[PDB]
């Protein structure tokens, strides 16, 4: 009950005559009324510092250039590949023929089959971009 008067950036120590004490360095309290401050996330290794820590906000991490964040709060870093590639365990590998990837991350997915709906292919697809189908036989020859 008495600890509620300690705001964010402090922790409550009832052994003090002035119970609300500010957080030590590398430490934060984001809510207030807490008996401790949490230790600032350090963005170590494959992590990088986006917003440095403060007394009231944890440090925010993003990944190093050649990586991309995954998970809540950038908890993970998956390696970036190029466009037209996908990430396999042996490294970044080009998309196989018939597949494409328009992102610097993820897997290759196949082209949309224009032949299934009876349409010719207007522009050739590539590793980076999908195909663009021509008109259906109903518009191309009957309307």
């Amino acid at each position: 009950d008495p600890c509620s008067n300690c705001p964010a950036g402090t922790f409550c120590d009832n052994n003090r005559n002035q119970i609300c004490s500010p957080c030590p360095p590398n430490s934060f309290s984001s809510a207030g009324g807490q008996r401790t401050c949490d230790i600032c996330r350090q963005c170590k290794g494959v992590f990088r510092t986006r917003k440095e820590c403060s007394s009231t906000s944890n440090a925010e991490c993003d990944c190093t250039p050649g990586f991309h964040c995954l998970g809540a709060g950038c908890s993970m870093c998956e390696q970036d590949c190029k466009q037209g590639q996908e990430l396999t365990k042996k490294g970044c590998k080009d998309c196989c023929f018939g597949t494409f990837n328009d992102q610097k991350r993820g897997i290759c997915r196949p082209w949309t089959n224009c032949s299934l709906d009876g349409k010719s292919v207007l522009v050739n697809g590539t590793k980076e971009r999908d195909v663009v189908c021509g008109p259906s036989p109903e518009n191309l020859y009957f309307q």
Partner: antibody
Amino acid sequence: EVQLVQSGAEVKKPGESLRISCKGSGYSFSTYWISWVRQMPGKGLEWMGKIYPGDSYTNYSPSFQGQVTISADKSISTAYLQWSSLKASDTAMYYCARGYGIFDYWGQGTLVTVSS
Amino acid sequence: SYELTQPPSVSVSPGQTASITCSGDNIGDQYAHWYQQKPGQSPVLVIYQDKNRPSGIPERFSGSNSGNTATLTISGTQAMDEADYYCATYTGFGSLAVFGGGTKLTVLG
């Protein structure tokens, strides 16, 4: 904050049709795969298939090929898991997760319960 | 399609390390991811890409993957680690993800 909010619990009858949704907010919904995962009562996790909402490309595991339909209306950042006729064997918990391999976000899961 | 085998039950004593295997044909050619799940709660990943650990996961969680077995290792296992553990992998061949059968790690009390 990136979030995946799923539909409420469903209580259907055998033969009825059902479609649950998975609304993904806080990120570019079109360029992240959405995978649907099944978990029977007291059983493990079963990957059902994924979908890329950018072009609605869908994929399925052999256990669910031709059993369910996965769809995505990327104009409202929502993926779907659709049945045509529910069997009593379909009582389970259905999670949607973001990603093809690493599932870094999970919805709260939609419980379905088919019975007379 | 692809099948990943993990023992249904592994026990361990307080403070001693637990190992949980995930066996599949040439799983060592794929990235292995381990997910922890507790009653009434969505699965939360503990190890991704064989060995890497996400931020917020205790350093006692360990992972390796080679040959036909990926394994999750938990040093100094504490009572909070008693939960179901699922290994997972994605293979480009067929472009599907598969979960292991699940292992219930029991911390003996």
